[PDB]
């Protein structure tokens, strides 16, 4: 239910955890702002679903319709490969919209980390500021939560993303466009 | 102002010339919402939207905001989501189903047909009666529909839907009439703004195959090719046509035979379904009596003024006007209605990944226009005529094999009716003359 | 652009009919700020925010800001806040006290009464004088007060303020001469911006209760009542009245005798100490001459163009006009100088919760006015007239107990007389016939 | 003194201390965020005094001009009793300018704890961006730091706000309103 | 609309006043792009910022966007960055060296001259020719240079960019031809934007040391002074001379002798380098011939419409017109060719410090120019004129020594020439008149 | 190579080193934001260099081009002193830009920080958002990152910038000015 928080504990997971999971995320944040798709792919599990729902205008009382349900259209829902596809366009020196390309910033704020029944996997929750400048005065904010599975692991940065649901704070899309991944 | 001589002149259907200022100028804008929208048969959606006796739908005709609705009888109103009494919405929910609606400012409540139907306190204020509820409701829209899509019109002076669609209807059934069990909308609409003329983004899609063909799509095709398969491995074919329509500057490009493109874009499993098998026999059946509809490789249309789909692809949206330099997209996807579900699916997975804002084709499309409309604001940038004459009086590009005027797939000829028909609405007060 | 004809022919006085037009279109708005704004008496703010010699407050008239500040020998001088030399800002603090005010651009001095004093390298650079220091001070605009309010206006041909309040001072009496000893103002202006036409605003304030006693307004009562009682237990009180000024365009309306409803907005004692007690009792001895004024309750008034404030709740504000799309809302407190501190106090916290920014009540107030200007920018949203009939011509409405022309409470009579007036501004030129 | 910064110690407070603060503040914002305004209003103590002080210009030596006073008027002034009252309205269905609800993100930032004498006592200084959309395409920002004395408890999400000062970094509300907590 | 009668009434250039309105009229900013920008010489930069061949920089003429571009034959083409196809942006990249320019909307491919050579599926699409590519490129502009600045012209019936320089180019040269080695441009180009009319900045860097001379810059001063040294160390020089070109409206200001002044600013190195030595006698010796310029003191210049520089400081740029109300500031650092590099690095570190948006001297500059826009949205800080009269018919202010009209360094002569020439612009349709 | 990130270690340092690091940055944004430049300039070593390019629009495959290199015109390139110049004339009552001042949010986040081969010596990458609202209306908000080469110190707020370098998420300043300080 994405009109609900996620079950965080009111008591929260410890320094070490935290720490772990918000540093993974900033250094996500670098590679998104860099430019090094690839290796941002490489931080994505093979059965990752990417999703960004639509969202509507609503009664508070019949709140249950604002999100477009799974199986719906939506502005993202991807898969590893389809990922991977979009990164291939995306350095390939082609795609106009992103070449020259934007300046971007991913600042992550508001982490709480939820521990699930089973070890090693986490349910986090985040909120995201991306801030995107292009051309000579293009300047669009996106701001959002983003609540992902995670896989902690011993190799890489320390953890995969099984799983990304972007509940982006808009309805209409008032960006020029969605060029950047969250 | 504006005199319908220098509006007329703005655009030289013959030569192929563009005077830039129609895509920025503020007072032409003005003129467009009454010439233009005001009086065009415009998209507001799919059948599918407002199955039920109740549901509605709250969208845009240009940049009045109006309710449609699925009446008790099965047929639809469209009004205005405007209170007569001071301006306030009516309703600002997207859509559901509803017993009645309220403004909220006074208490103002209407019945599902647009009637005002209670003013509190109306007979302590309005009498002692001179007033009447029954003068009071929001302005009705004509409202028709074509194969699952609905349409909407003011003027009630304005040729009915069908007979404004002209000789384009053979070409839109590519699309909505494959089958008898017709088509679905996938639930779920895109909004999005993009800070561009309208005509910029209609008149791509009714004759513009060309930016296609060339640069704008090459990372597009990267992303949606196999991984092991580039660029180099893709022919672009080399044989397409064209259709400008008879009447109203309805248009539609395509290439012949070679859905290997399509595949390159769609997938597969897509192209598979759309080629071969009981569906496509059975599109040919229906079809084939207009059109050679089987040989139509990604197929690109628009019904004036702002209607435009991608037959094959299946992206369906409206582009709503927002003054000369802003438009908002309003996409959705339709599917066959008896479409196996893994079918359907897989349309719903490639027009996010393509067509959808934020796809690998969509995002290279609002670029251009994007970049044109900035340009927009030099001086010497109005000063000269945009060149619209691609095989403008160039012989041997039609295919008779095809009804109505056609050209080959890179062409303007539908641009130039596209534009000759904006400046005919913009000149001409009357449908006494219009009409024909 | 627009003939004095076609501008009175946007609002029909009789048949009660507004053309959309007067709330969005640009053209017009430039001549609101010549014809109404540039000639019309504007509310400033209250005596309390300049009460020393030298204390200044830095606000608005229409779009040209003002400096408003205290002379020694009490007197209020207004003038324009732009320097003549280059038109740079001359005080960009929002109040103090000043022994002078300088233009940080080259320096050009002021005193407090708006005189150019000093400029710098005058002899070396004006003179070898042609030029005079007495010609360039900043426009002054004329200045009076109405019982703690301090109004302008630049047109020296204009009605004197007294002149141009009409009949209407009694009830602005109301909440500004309960007592011998004034009001005071409570230290603090709030300002926000708002994206809709001064005139819903002003309106609404001028002859609009039945948004209030309607749906507007339903949640700010469940949030002013005390958390056992809920809206079922409030009786909206039939029986009120709305005054309509003999001349200018000044209205305000109210409800009688059931002071509940004033409890469930202000509380207990704010309420107790306005109907019952010394004070009251004091209050009915100087109102009463004029007016039945003890038996108002939650009266809302307007004063043409943008002084609004509510008697009772005692919220005064001014509406900027910014552009036909936007205001800016400069809002402040007044209560009795002799009322008990704890009287202040609670109009004070009273006050924040509901008629300021951010209030239970005036949030859902431009939720409407926002919706509705929205809305403006579709062509057929602007094409029909908007319903401002309510009880006009209708009889056996009035109350011959309260002076002038009267309505009940739930009436648009001083609406009428609201965009009458404006449509007089607008097309008449001299006061010769304005004045009238 | 609004104009002067809370007196923060240079050497931070423990580890510990400093993450339950924070994490405590990020759960805070989700009730906002997911509309659980009781739950919100759960947070604060019966002697809450919730201010958001009107900002004014004057020149940097009349800098003490600046804020309005305590006792004068005030974009919010409030106290238990008076927030319950908004939240009432808040969640009434009737309350227009909410309802449809906004899409809200309340971002916080810059987290720094001082320790008063009083043990279990804090005083909090933090920044906010709190990101608001709603109806079609409205969106505003709202930008400030808050400042908050909190008091640490056994139960509930181990914090209670006994005091939250809001300085907004306006002037006039360039906002359409102010429906947003903060 | 504006007849030239009340287009040249706008400015009184005798008696000195100024129309506010000229500031913020939309529909004169229409026309100054019209009859100002379109046929006026326009700084597009340095010769160094394109020095090898294939070199180019996308720059700006008013509000069209331009390619400037270093040709084989080591001459400067200047064209429209529009494609004619459709209006896209040709190159989007802010400089480098290419050996071609496409356009990614529809692949429209040029050479570094601009001509279009190639256009895919030409012979296809376009012919069975009646489409030549020789007919469509971009709009060229005249392009020329004077002593390492480049400037464009549209009109090819305006005077020569040397004869449209009138009398102004000695006091150009104090700046850009101290040495036979020529001047070299720093790396990097500042660009920013400003919310105000061009006018207000080029105008002051026309005619305006008073801003200076008073209370624009004393907290630049003291930024720029050491640490030991306050205001009260720091004499302004009484003694200064303006310069009004006889034909133009450039004009250029400065004070005499003190270059403490200068010093004060730039600081001793660069003042030395400026006034002591084998480079300071080697300028005296070229410039002596036409001008006193050895005692010339922190010089500012203004080559109508909007060109501006500061000889001795060394920053230059270009006004941008972005609308009546904003402008973009491109700036850039210019040093002697042959100066020592420590005086370069010198000249760089004090130019970011100063006069780069950001610097101590710079972001006061635009501190008035946006209050006063702001302003201007009053309808009374509109209906009078601006004071423009320090100094007019005032005699005794010139000095015979400097060539041309001069008067006192704080005088609005040369402003009073500026505001001329460009009403003269703006009323005269025909150079027949205009070169006069 | 401002193309690319710093060289952050895949394992994030000490919790205790993240804390003082943030806590530092998080003290220095107070002090800017309640304008005691003096104590600002103080957390700056003799050695500091400020400096804030130019950045320039170029295919991704030109992106070398992209950044003004040392040496050329930059938006700020500063020294100590330039630096206490610059607050001089700041703080002097004269410097109308600021006078009114403005009022700031110096939002820090994403701190990631990189041990150097210098006990001590640290090499910082951190988002900000500066949000600065002044006279009646106008907001600005500057987004970037910067990159600080900090030096442990046992007194004062425990660290000194010995060197900062501000990539600016704009190439044409849209921004009114920049009067603030990053
Ligand atoms: S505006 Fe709808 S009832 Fe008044
Ligand atoms: S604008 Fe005020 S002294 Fe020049
Ligand atoms: S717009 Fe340039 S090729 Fe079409
Ligand atoms: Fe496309
Ligand atoms: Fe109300
Ligand atoms: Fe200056």
């Given at each position: 239910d994405l009109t609900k928080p996620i079950e965080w504990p009111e008591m929260p997971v410890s320094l070490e955890l935290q720490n772990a999971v918000e540093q993974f995320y900033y250094r996500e944040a670098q590679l998104l702002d860099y430019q090094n798709y690839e290796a941002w792919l490489a931080?994505?599990?093979?059965?990752?679903?990417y999703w960004m729902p639509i969202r509507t205008t609503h009664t508070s009382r019949n709140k249950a319709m604002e999100y477009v349900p799974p199986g719906g259209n939506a502005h993202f829902d991807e898969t590893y490969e389809s990922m991977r596809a979009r990164i291939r366009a995306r350095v390939s020196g082609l795609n106009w919209t992103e070449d020259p390309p934007s300046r971007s910033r991913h600042i992550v704020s508001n982490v709480i980390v939820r521990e699930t029944e089973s070890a090693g996997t986490l349910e986090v929750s985040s909120a995201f500021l991306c801030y995107r400048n292009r051309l000579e005065r293009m300047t669009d904010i996106y701001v959002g939560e983003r609540r992902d599975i995670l896989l902690r692991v011993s190799?890489?940065?320390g953890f995969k993303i099984a799983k990304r649901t972007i509940l982006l704070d808009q309805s209409t899309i008032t960006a020029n466009n969605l060029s950047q991944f969250f | 102002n504006w005199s319908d001589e220098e509006i007329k002149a703005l655009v030289d259907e013959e030569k192929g010339l563009?005077?830039?200022?129609?895509?920025?100028?503020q007072d032409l804008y003005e003129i467009e919402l009454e010439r233009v929208f005001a009086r065009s048969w415009l998209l507001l959606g799919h059948e599918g939207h407002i199955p039920k006796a109740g549901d509605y739908l709250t969208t845009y005709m240009g940049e009045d905001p109006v309710i449609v609705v699925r009446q008790k009888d099965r047929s639809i109103k469209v009004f205005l989501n405007?209170?007569?009494?001071?301006?306030?919405?009516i309703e600002r929910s997207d859509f559901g189903n509803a017993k009645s609606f309220t403004?909220?400012?006074?208490?103002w409540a209407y019945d599902t047909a647009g009637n005002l139907v209670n003013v509190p306190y109306e007979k302590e204020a309005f009498c002692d009666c001179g007033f009447?509820?029954?003068?009071?409701g929001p302005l009705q829209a004509r409202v028709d529909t074509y194969k699952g899509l609905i349409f909407a019109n003011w003027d009630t002076e304005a040729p009915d839907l069908k007979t404004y669609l002209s000789d384009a209807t053979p070409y839109m059934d590519?699309?909505?009439?494959?089958?008898?069990?017709v088509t679905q909308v996938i639930t779920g609409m895109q909004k999005t703004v993009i800070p561009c003329n309208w005509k910029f983004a209609a008149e791509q899609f009714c004759s513009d195959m060309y930016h296609a063909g060339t640069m704008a799509h090459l990372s597009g095709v990267l992303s949606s090719?196999?991984?092991?398969?580039?660029?180099?491995?893709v022919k672009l074919p080399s044989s397409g046509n064209q259709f400008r329509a008879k009447w109203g500057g309805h248009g539609t490009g395509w290439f012949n035979d070679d859905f290997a493109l399509l595949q390159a874009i769609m997938g597969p499993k897509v192209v598979d379904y759309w080629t071969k098998g009981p569906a496509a026999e059975r599109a040919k059946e229906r079809l084939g009596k207009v059109?050679?509809?089987?040989?139509?490789?990604?197929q690109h249309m628009t019904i004036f003024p702002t209607c435009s789909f991608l037959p094959g692809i299946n992206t369906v949206r409206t582009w709503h006007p927002?003054?000369?330099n802003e438009i908002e997209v309003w996409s959705f996807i339709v599917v066959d209605a008896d479409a196996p579900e893994d079918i359907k699916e897989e349309y719903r997975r490639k027009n996010i990944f393509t067509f959808?804002?934020?796809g690998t084709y969509e995002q290279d499309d609002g670029e251009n226009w994007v970049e044109v409309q900035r340009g927009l604001r030099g001086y010497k940038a109005r000063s000269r005529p945009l060149c619209?004459?691609?095989?403008?009086?160039?012989?041997?590009?039609?295919?008779?094999?095809?009804?109505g005027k056609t050209s080959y797939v890179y062409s303007e000829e539908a641009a130039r009716g596209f534009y000759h028909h904006w400046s005919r609405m913009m000149s001409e007060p009357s449908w006494d003359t219009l009409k024909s």
């Open positions: 931080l994505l599990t093979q059965d990752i679903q190799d890489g940065l | 563009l005077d830039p200022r129609i895509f920025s100028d405007q209170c007569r009494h001071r301006g306030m919405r403004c909220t400012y006074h208490g009447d509820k029954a003068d009071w590519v699309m909505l009439d494959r089958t008898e069990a090719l196999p991984p092991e398969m580039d660029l180099s491995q059109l050679p509809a089987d040989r139509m490789v990604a927002r003054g000369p959808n804002q934020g619209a004459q691609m095989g403008a009086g160039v012989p041997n590009k039609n295919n008779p094999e095809f009804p």
